[PDB]
Amino acid sequence: RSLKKGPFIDLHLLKKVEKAVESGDKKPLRTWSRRSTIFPNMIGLTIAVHNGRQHVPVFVTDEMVGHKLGEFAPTRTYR
Amino acid sequence: ARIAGINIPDHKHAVIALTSIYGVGKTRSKAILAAAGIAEDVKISELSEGQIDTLRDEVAKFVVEGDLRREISMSIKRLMDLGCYRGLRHRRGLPVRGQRTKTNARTRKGPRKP
Amino acid sequence: AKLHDYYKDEVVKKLMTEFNYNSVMQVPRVEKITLNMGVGEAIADKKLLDNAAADLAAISGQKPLITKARKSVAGFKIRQGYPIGCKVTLRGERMWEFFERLITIAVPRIRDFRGLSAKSFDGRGNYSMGVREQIIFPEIDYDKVDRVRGLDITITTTAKSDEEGRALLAAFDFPFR
Amino acid sequence: QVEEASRSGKIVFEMEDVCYQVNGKQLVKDFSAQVLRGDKIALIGPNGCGKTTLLKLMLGQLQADSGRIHVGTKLEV
Amino acid sequence: MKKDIHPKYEEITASCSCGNVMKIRSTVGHDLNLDVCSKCHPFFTGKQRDVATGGRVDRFNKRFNI
RNA sequence: UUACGACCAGGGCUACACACGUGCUACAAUGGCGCAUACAAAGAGAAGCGACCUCGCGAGAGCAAGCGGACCUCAUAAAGUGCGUCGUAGUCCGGAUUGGAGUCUGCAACUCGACUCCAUGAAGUCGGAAUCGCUAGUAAUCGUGGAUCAGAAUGCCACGG
RNA sequence: UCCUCCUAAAGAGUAACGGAGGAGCACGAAGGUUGGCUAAUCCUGGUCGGACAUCAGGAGGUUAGUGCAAUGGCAUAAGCC
Numbered sequence: 001r002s003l004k005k006g007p008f009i010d011l012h013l014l015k016k017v018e019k020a021v022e023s024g025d026k027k028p029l030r031t032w033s034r035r036s037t038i039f040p041n042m043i044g045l046t047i048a049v050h051n052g053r054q055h056v057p058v059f060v061t062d063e064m065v066g067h068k069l070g071e072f073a074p075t076r077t078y079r
Numbered sequence: 080a081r082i083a084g085i086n087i088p089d090h091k092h093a094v095i096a097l098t099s100i101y102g103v104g105k106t107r108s109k110a111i112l113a114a115a116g117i118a119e120d121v122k123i124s125e126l127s128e129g130q131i132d133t134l135r136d137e138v139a140k141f142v143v144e145g146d147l148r149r150e151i152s153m154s155i156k157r158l159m160d161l162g163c164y165r166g167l168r169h170r171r172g173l174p175v176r177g178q179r180t181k182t183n184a185r186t187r188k189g190p191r192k193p
Numbered sequence: 194a195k196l197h198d199y200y201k202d203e204v205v206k207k208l209m210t211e212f213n214y215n216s217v218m219q220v221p222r223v224e225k226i227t228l229n230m231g232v233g234e235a236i237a238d239k240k241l242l243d244n245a246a247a248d249l250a251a252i253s254g255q256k257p258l259i260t261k262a263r264k265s266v267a268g269f270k271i272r273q274g275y276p277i278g279c280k281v282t283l284r285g286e287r288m289w290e291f292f293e294r295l296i297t298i299a300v301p302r303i304r305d306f307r308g309l310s311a312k313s314f315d316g317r318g319n320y321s322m323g324v325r326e327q328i329i330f331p332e333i334d335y336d337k338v339d340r341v342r343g344l345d346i347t348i349t350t351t352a353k354s355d356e357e358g359r360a361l362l363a364a365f366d367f368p369f370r
Numbered sequence: 371q372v373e374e375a376s377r378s379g380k381i382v383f384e385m386e387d388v389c390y391q392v393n394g395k396q397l398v399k400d401f402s403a404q405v406l407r408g409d410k411i412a413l414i415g416p417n418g419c420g421k422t423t424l425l426k427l428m429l430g431q432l433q434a435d436s437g438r439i440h441v442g443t444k445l446e447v
Numbered sequence: 448m449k450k451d452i453h454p455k456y457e458e459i460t461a462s463c464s465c466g467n468v469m470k471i472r473s474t475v476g477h478d479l480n481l482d483v484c485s486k487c488h489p490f491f492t493g494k495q496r497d498v499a500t501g502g503r504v505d506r507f508n509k510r511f512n513i
Numbered sequence: 514u515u516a517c518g519a520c521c522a523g524g525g526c527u528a529c530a531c532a533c534g535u536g537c538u539a540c541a542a543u544g545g546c547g548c549a550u551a552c553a554a555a556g557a558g559a560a561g562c563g564a565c566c567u568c569g570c571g572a573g574a575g576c577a578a579g580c581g582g583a584c585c586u587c588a589u590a591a592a593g594u595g596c597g598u599c600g601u602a603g604u605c606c607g608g609a610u611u612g613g614a615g616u617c618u619g620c621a622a623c624u625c626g627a628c629u630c631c632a633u634g635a636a637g638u639c640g641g642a643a644u645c646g647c648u649a650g651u652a653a654u655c656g657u658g659g660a661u662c663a664g665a666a667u668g669c670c671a672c673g674g
Numbered sequence: 675u676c677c678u679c680c681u682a683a684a685g686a687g688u689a690a691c692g693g694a695g696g697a698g699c700a701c702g703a704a705g706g707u708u709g710g711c712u713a714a715u716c717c718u719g720g721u722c723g724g725a726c727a728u729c730a731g732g733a734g735g736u737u738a739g740u741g742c743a744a745u746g747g748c749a750u751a752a753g754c755c
């Protein structure tokens with residue numbers, strides 16, 4: 001959907017992803033970049049994604065590797 | 080006149096009776112008939128039984144009526160369990176392709192309610 | 194028929210050697226194929242049973258026996274004596290002759306076929322089955338039809354328990370999942 | 371009070387070139403007519419002129435000698 | 448049998464489209480040159496082809512070429 | 514007026530039991546789909562318009578001349594006409610809604626873009642009380658263009674048949 | 675006025691403005707015979723189809739039925755065809 005070559009992701013994220021494998025399981029990653037996708041070497045890592053006011057947590061599974069962090073955090077509330 | 084699921088429609092041109100299959104439109108029908116070499120104008124009720132064979136052989140190389148629904152229903156089921164935005168709209172019955180919700184979107188909801 | 198001549202010597206030996214049977218009768222035998230549909234909605238029209246009865250008669254070459262309401266039930270809005278379904282019980286060659294055509298030229302026309310369910314057993318080694326559509330048989334024209342009538346087929350066997358009931362059908366190439 | 375049902379197809383009966391004749395005399399000779407939805411038609415004429423048999427052709431009770439009849443598509447007669 | 452209250456019993460030739468010549472007795476009153484039979488059983492090819500839903504990483508790998 | 518000002522990132526203005534306004538596509542045969550074939554006006558273009566060629570089923574991708582423009586590009590106009598199929602069906606009408614693949618603009622397309630391919634094929638079979646526009650190249654119908662603009666029109670402003 | 679049960683004291687009968695319900699009919703088959711048959715209810719399995727419809731096999735053994743009350747009966751059926 002983005003484009004054939006070069007899926008587009010963030011810098012400060014991926015650098016902070018490659019350390020959470022260096023230092024294993026730790027505190028949830030408070031992150032804001034909903035515009036970055038997910039990657040295979042991310043599984044087992046909880047990312048506290050910004051919904052707009054706060055940091056809803058996740059627990060990434062395999063199938064969420066071709067997607068972006070954003071849709072895993074609903075923006076508004078209802079009923 | 081029996082094809083993958085069923086060919087009820089006889090008495091009609093071949094490029095249209097073939098569209099009754101769940102998985103063949105006006106376009107795939109041309110490709111199938113061109114692959115077989117049957118003139119598009121033929122009427123199924125006059126097609127020879129040696130050519131209906133050639134008709135059946137084609138739809139075996141394309142996902143068709145039967146397994147397509149399990150392919151689709153699982154994909155929707157996969158997203159629904161995922162809790163994504165695409166999943167969470169399916170579980171509630173709301174538009175998923177970024178359409179309006181203030182006034183329109185009667186296809187997804189249904190008739191009105193006071 | 195064309196399946197009985199097979200069973201009398203082959204399926205016997207495929208089970209006598211399997212289940213450790215010293216007698217040609219400790220092995221089970223399949224004795225009848227009951228078959229019926231409950232039309233149910235014939236309250237609106239009797240033609241919904243007059244024409245439906247000709248469907249079992251068009252599958253089994255036997256005129257069906259209409260069944261009736263055993264006890265009045267208020268919820269379904271029926272009382273005793275309504276004709277609410279036809280029934281056919283097959284025995285002998287017509288049992289085997291129909292048994293041949295069902296597992297050969299009727300099963301492979303089920304829409305969305307992914308094997309045959311195996312857990313549908315009643316603790317004594319009997320099989321029950323549904324089809325959800327009657328056009329899967331080569332005796333329905335698609336032009337004499339007005340509804341989507343289904344069936345219930347209950348193979349009734351003399352096996353003493355379920356776990357060998359599979360063996361009786363498996364030895365006939367029954368597409369168990 | 372009547373029991374209305376879903377609307378039938380826009381064409382109820384269509385018969386053209388239909389010509390049915392009893393042994394002696396002709397009852398209908400080369401008919402060509404159409405009956406549309408919501409059209410109210412009165413058959414009138416003399417005695418024994420084929421009014422009852424004309425309806426029989428429409429419902430297919432007895433077969434036309436020629437010309438063919440096509441019936442509506444969601445009819446509840 | 449109760450002497451002609453049952454419909455006809457015609458011996459028909461189940462002539463399958465891909466060989467598999469057969470022979471039966473049915474209440475059709477008409478022959479049939481039909482499609483697949485139990486010998487031409489698509490019970491296994493579609494059984495193993497059930498492995499088509501699952502995995503998302505494997506699709507990513509081809510899509511990744513940067 | 515050490516915050517009713519200033520900077521940053523994420524979200525919202527795109528919600529949804531419903532009600533109203535204005536428009537678009539239609540419910541088909543004065544038509545839909547195919548094949549070849551016609552007759553215009555007006556306008557825009559330099560971190561722009563983009564040939565020809567090649568490749569891609571298609572959006573388009575590569576190379577790439579020309580034009581500050583009566584010079585070159587957008588620019589193939591569509592209704593029309595000639596032949597063929599459809600024979601009144603929820604249809605070869607309807608093109609909504611969902612599932613896959615993709616192309617681009619843009620640091621970034623999930624919340625929230627447009628377009629393309631394959632598939633799917635929903636209401637809808639002329640609309641209650643009631644109400645609107647219009648007097649001649651007008652009404653009705655057909656396409657074209659422009660501004661805003663990186664991308665984004667069923668609107669607006671123009672132009673012809 | 676007539677029928678059934680209790681009071682009514684283990685034969686019959688036995689009262690009260692004592693305690694509870696019914697009848698004023700129906701049926702040319704719902705009668706006579708000759709054949710044949712056996713329910714309720716729950717569990718398990720099965721298309722729609724469900725708490726309850728039709729179907730299959732298990733437990734159970736008359737807890738069912740009887741043209742209409744209650745009592746007594748009824749499988750040799752007095753029930754069903």
Ligand SMILES: Nc1ncnc2c1ncn2[C@@H]1O[C@H](COP(=O)(O)OP(=O)(O)OP(=O)(O)O)[C@@H](O)[C@H]1O
Nearest residue numbers: 392393395397415416417418419420421422423424
């Ligand atoms: N079964 C039959 N066999 C032979 N002739 C018949 C039959 N039925 C009708 N006819 C003849 O067909 C003709 C038309 O008969 P039909 O019943 O259609 O009459 P009709 O036009 O309806 O008249 P009417 O108003 O007198 O009933 C008559 O000549 C009649 O005698």
Ligand SMILES: [Mg+2]
Nearest residue numbers: 181525526527
């Ligand atoms: Mg706004």
Ligand SMILES: [Mg+2]
Nearest residue numbers: 177527625626
């Ligand atoms: Mg928008």
Ligand SMILES: [Mg+2]
Nearest residue numbers: 545606607608
């Ligand atoms: Mg179309």
Ligand SMILES: [Mg+2]
Nearest residue numbers: 104105608632
């Ligand atoms: Mg399409």
Ligand SMILES: [Mg+2]
Nearest residue numbers: 603635636637
């Ligand atoms: Mg509808």
Ligand SMILES: [Mg+2]
Nearest residue numbers: 380602603638
């Ligand atoms: Mg219509």
Ligand SMILES: [Mg+2]
Nearest residue numbers: 661662664665
């Ligand atoms: Mg723009």
Ligand SMILES: [Mg+2]
Nearest residue numbers: 557659660662
């Ligand atoms: Mg512009």
Ligand SMILES: [Mg+2]
Nearest residue numbers: 682685686687
């Ligand atoms: Mg006494």
Ligand SMILES: [Mg+2]
Nearest residue numbers: 682683684685
């Ligand atoms: Mg005494």
Ligand SMILES: [Mg+2]
Nearest residue numbers: 704705740741
């Ligand atoms: Mg009696």
Ligand SMILES: [Mg+2]
Nearest residue numbers: 708709710750
């Ligand atoms: Mg007796």
Ligand SMILES: [Mg+2]
Nearest residue numbers: 704705706752
């Ligand atoms: Mg008696």
